[PDB]
Amino acid sequence: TLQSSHITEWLFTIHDDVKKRALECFLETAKVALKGRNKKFQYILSDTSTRVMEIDGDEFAEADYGLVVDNSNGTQELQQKLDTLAQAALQT
Amino acid sequence: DDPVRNKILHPMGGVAFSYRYDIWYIGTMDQPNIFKCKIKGDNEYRGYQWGIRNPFTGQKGNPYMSFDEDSAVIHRMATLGVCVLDPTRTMSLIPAILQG
Amino acid sequence: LDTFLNSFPTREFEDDNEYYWDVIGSSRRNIPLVEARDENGVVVAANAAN
Amino acid sequence: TTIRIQHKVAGNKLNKKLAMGIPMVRNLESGKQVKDTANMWMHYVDWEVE
Amino acid sequence: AFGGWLNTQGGDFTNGVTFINEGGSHEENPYQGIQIGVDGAPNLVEQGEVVYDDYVFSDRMEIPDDIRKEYKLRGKTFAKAAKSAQRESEERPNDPLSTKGLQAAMERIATAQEEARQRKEAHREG
Amino acid sequence: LMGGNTQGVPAERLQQGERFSIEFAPVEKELSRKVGDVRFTSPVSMRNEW
Amino acid sequence: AGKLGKFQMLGFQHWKGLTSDNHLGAIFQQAPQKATNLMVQLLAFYRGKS
Amino acid sequence: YNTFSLKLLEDALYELSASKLAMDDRLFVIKTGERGAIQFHKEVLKTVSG
Amino acid sequence: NFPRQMLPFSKKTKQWRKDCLLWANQKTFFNYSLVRKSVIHKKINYDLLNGRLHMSDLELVLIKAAYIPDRLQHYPIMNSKLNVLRGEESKRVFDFKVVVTNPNAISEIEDNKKNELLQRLQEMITDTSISEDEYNIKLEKLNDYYTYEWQDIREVRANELLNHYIKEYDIPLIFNNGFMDAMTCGEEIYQCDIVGGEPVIERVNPLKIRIFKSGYSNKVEDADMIILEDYWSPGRVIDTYYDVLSPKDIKYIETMPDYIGERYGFVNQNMIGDEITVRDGTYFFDPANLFTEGIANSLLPYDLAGNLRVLRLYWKSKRKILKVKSYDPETGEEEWNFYPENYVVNKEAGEEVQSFWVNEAWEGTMIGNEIFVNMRPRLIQYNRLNNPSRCHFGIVGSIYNLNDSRPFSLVDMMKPYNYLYDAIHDRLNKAIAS
Amino acid sequence: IVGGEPVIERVNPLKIRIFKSGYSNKVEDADMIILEDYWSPGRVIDTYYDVLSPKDIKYIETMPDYAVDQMDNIDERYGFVNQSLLPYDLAGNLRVLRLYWKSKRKILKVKSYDPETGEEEWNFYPENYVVNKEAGEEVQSFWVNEAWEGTMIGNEIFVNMRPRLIQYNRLNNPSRCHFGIVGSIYNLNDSRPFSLVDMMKPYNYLYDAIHDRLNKAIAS
Amino acid sequence: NFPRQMLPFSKKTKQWRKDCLLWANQKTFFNYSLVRKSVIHKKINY
Amino acid sequence: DLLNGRLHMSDLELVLIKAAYIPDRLQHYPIMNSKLNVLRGEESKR
Ligand SMILES: [Mg+2]
């Protein structure tokens, strides 16, 4: 049924795009909520992550700083590539 | 007390509809006695019948013309009603100069 | 007149053209008399004995 | 009860500014006339249709 | 609390200015101020002063006409001029152009207050 | 005459000076056509001297 | 419907339904615009300083 | 009615509510006009002068 | 008439912001968008999947009673086609993480901002530690961050924001409901916003969003003016606007008659004729000149059930700014900066200025018709670095069309076959009967 | 929470009245939710032993175990059934009506300056809080949802009419609260839900009519 | 009628809290949700 | 327009209508979509 999944992959391909930008938009929305006197964001963010807000660049989008919300095939190989390297570093 | 709609004056000064006594709520019923009836959720019309432009919505250009005039006609229609389940829970007392 | 008609609640109806509500009375009732008869089948008048 | 209303205007009244010699008013729902400062004519028509 | 803050959409957004109200004057308040901090240690303020980046704009002074046409100030006091420099940046705390427009304008009133304080100090000792 | 009135209006209620006000505009349910209209106003001014 | 002061030359006016430009002029809400940049000097060779 | 009488109104707000409503459930708020209350006031004045 | 957005900010007053909302309430329900379809066309495609068959959408009508000898039974054979594709999407893996696109590209402006961070952490460990009791363990925490780079600290924060809120909201269900709305009308739209202090995400009903002033763009972000109507509860408007609603506006919510509870209310533009037919609650028109029937096209009544009506208008207005050319004091570098219109130019130092008109995203809300709330420039300006004018609202989505057309949905290409199935299964239900 | 320990039950979707939901497919998003069930007399004392008076235990005991108006009027519409209103069942079970409703609480938003550092702080206090003047405290008064509850048992017992003690609170909203009732509607795009039974019910009605003609052909 | 919820905490007395229940009494007959079907339609399904 | 399910009657025959009814117009059956949609789904997996 792979070649029938070729027929409907045109729906998923644009749907994987909307899931990218709805998380690119949510990440900018969450970035403004940090600078709004919110005691929750000190619980879900670390020491060094709660200090990035004081640098004068947190108003712009993360696409202008070299960061994208990427679910592609390259980042899933890299996520495995750091894991099989981790176990092969565990032994030895 | 309204002198615009109530037009019969009473001989003892003022309008005659203001001398009417009405007891709208008598006791406890365990439901609304008087309520407003309304179909499928308020349903209302906001039609528009316009020619080469629409002054109402502010639109020049019509791909599907209503007529060829330089006009705009608005149509609005609504259906509505009131209910009294128990009219014995309401007692009126009306002056007779208003004629029944 | 508008703020008079705002104190009354609302009820959505499923369209249709008319509404009915059912009103109920009491189950207990006293029944009038037509006439009483004695043992031999004749009626009891007003000017009769016990 | 089913009710209906309708207003017809000319087409040139789309952007028709009012050079207010006398101040242009809106009828309130309470019966009063309130002075308004808006200058376009269809702002005053669409008040009165509702 | 509406003083230099945009309390909207469930959060507390500020543009840096600290509008200082409801305490009292230095003579009328029993604690001789509001005492916002322990830095000197008694940092005292009153009902009119505003603060931007630990710099106090005084409400008891006035604006000289020499230092009004220069620096293009709008308020009659230095505090009421820094209450008029942040009127654009009040509704927009996270705008990058408005944060740059505020800090560039807040250094002018910081400069102009030091010019007027120097002119008042030099004239009285003379 | 609406309201189901069959015997007519008495002639002493159709005299000169009888005031008529606008109630509403009821239309038929199927294939209705446009009724009703929309009413406007304008104010006055006064003056004084020295 | 009368006068409140002596110089109440204006009266309260009202109409129904379709409003033309003429209804907007009879209520003194239309005035000719002045093209302020348009200013003409009648062409002549003036010799008053001669 | 023509002549108001409170002796009838207490005898007509009671006979429908005699042994059907409780003792705390007999507050009867009358909605009327400004002139109906003076017709009510002058007839409570005739009870308390009797 | 929409008010002029080419104004200074002092002339964008209380009545000007209110006049923008009274325009969106009154005039626009227009639904004239070049790439997206009409609200009665999408609603039929939704009603076919709840098993409701409109007889005015497969023939000319010549009924309204719920019985088969003059209506038509529906046989829902399009639902199981679509429930495989919303079932596969739920079983695909969902690992959307933030990455550095070039992790081996570290610069000097990156390395300066890392050193600003490690100084600002170093000031904190001197103040918090009470005289070397934990100054050694707090320094051991940040000796790891000497190896960390600025594109990593930005990513660790940007992944920690997503990894929590994906796991909290069940964001894979917000998206899975959206892909079902992608296959019926061809419109998938999501709204991301700060509500109650936290970021939220919601999918927007494509029958309840009006996208104006776009340029045959498939992207919803490209629009200039988005109006979102819905029926919110009174509890949800106090969850959102506890902070901006006057005590007078609470008495508007608190003086509401009672409750009532998809016939909100119908508009028809470009009516050819006056003859409208209704007594059950849907409006019937001319047979071929018009719609021929009215399926709700708008949310006109300010309160249905007890639920209030919350109209939100987001719009791009114009903001005057300044571009200032200033020289570096140390070396001879012309530097460009962007200041607003209230910034006064420092002459006698070479600052050359020119004034640009620039988009600004604004928002405004009316709840019912008496409450007017949050009329202000939108506080999440979705900003870009070199572009002052490039912004959008929280509303993000896409139209699934081919070449700037209206979207031929998966229901739209199966609806002519499903109408014929109902036609032939009625001959079968009458052949069985006789 | 009943018996000091938290429980979890399922709500019968015929025995709940969800008021003022905002085209939400959820149940926590409701402003008012009525739960009407019939409880055993053991369950009304396993739940409310600590708050019932001896007057109200008498009503649970000296109910007839098979109600009349204040002026002795018999309620004649108690004796009809459809093809509630009945405080005790004919199985000895009491009507238990539970009203949950979001009220409105006035609170204050208070701006405080920290004593040591010059940083403003925000807290929320109830409306009986007196503000600390001569210290810079600025106060603004908001209105805020507060989940209340109440219970009626039969017709005369009125128990636990108080603010709900499990306020499902969030950290930034003083106003985000709901009740214990959590659930979801399985619908599509703000509609009424088309269930699996509803999409098979037209085919089960066609099976019974053709298994009818089959059975009358078998018989004859 | 459902009594006023815009009150202080002091005016929410015992008779006020008893009024909200006596309002809620006999309200289980009707249907009040825009995204629920009726109880006479789900009892057919069970 | 064929891929968007629009049939123009002026391309498959000389017409001697503007009322969209199958007793005068033709119903289009979109079968060239799933032929093209395989090849665009194979671009997304190379
Ligand atoms: Mg943590």
From Swiss-Prot, chain B:
Record-annotated disulphide pairs: none
Subcellular location field: Virion
Domain of life from the UniProt record: Viruses
Additional remarks: Displays an HK-97-like fold with an insertion domain that protrudes at the capsid surface.
Subunit relationships: Interacts with the auxiliary capsid protein (via FD region). Interacts with the head fiber dimeric protein. Interacts with the head fiber trimeric protein. Interacts with the portal vertex auxiliary protein.
Role summary: Capsid protein self-assembles to form an icosahedral capsid, with a T=9 symmetry, about 77 nm in diameter. Each asymmetric capsid nonamer is covered by 9 capsid auxiliary protein, 1 copy of the trimeric head fiber protein and 2 copies of the dimeric head fiber protein.
Protein name: Major capsid protein
Organism lineage string: Viruses, Duplodnaviria, Heunggongvirae, Uroviricota, Caudoviricetes
Residue span relative to the full protein: 405 to 504 of 504
UniProtKB/Swiss-Prot annotation, chain E:
UniProt subcellular location: Virion; Host membrane
Chain spans, region Interaction with the portal protein: 1-126
Biological role: Protein that is stored in high quantity in the viral capsid and may play a role during ejection.
Assembly notes: Homododecamer. Interacts with the portal protein.
Name of protein: Cargo protein 1
Parent sequence residues shown: 425 to 552 of 842
Curated annotation (Swiss-Prot), chain G:
Record field: transmembrane: none
Subcellular location: Virion
Origin superkingdom: Viruses
Record's subunit section: Interacts with the auxiliary capsid protein (via FD region). Interacts with the head fiber dimeric protein. Interacts with the head fiber trimeric protein. Interacts with the portal vertex auxiliary protein.
Function field: Capsid protein self-assembles to form an icosahedral capsid, with a T=9 symmetry, about 77 nm in diameter. Each asymmetric capsid nonamer is covered by 9 capsid auxiliary protein, 1 copy of the trimeric head fiber protein and 2 copies of the dimeric head fiber protein.
Something else known: Displays an HK-97-like fold with an insertion domain that protrudes at the capsid surface.
Protein name in UniProt: Major capsid protein
Shown residues within the full chain: 2 to 51 of 504
Swiss-Prot record, chain K:
Coiled-coil regions, chain positions: none
Localization of this protein: Virion
Disulfide partners: none
Self-association and partners: Homododecamer. Interacts with the Cargo protein 1. Interacts with the major capsid protein.
Function (record text): Forms the portal vertex of the capsid. Probably involved in head assembly, genome packaging, tail attachment, and genome ejection.
Descriptive protein name: Portal protein
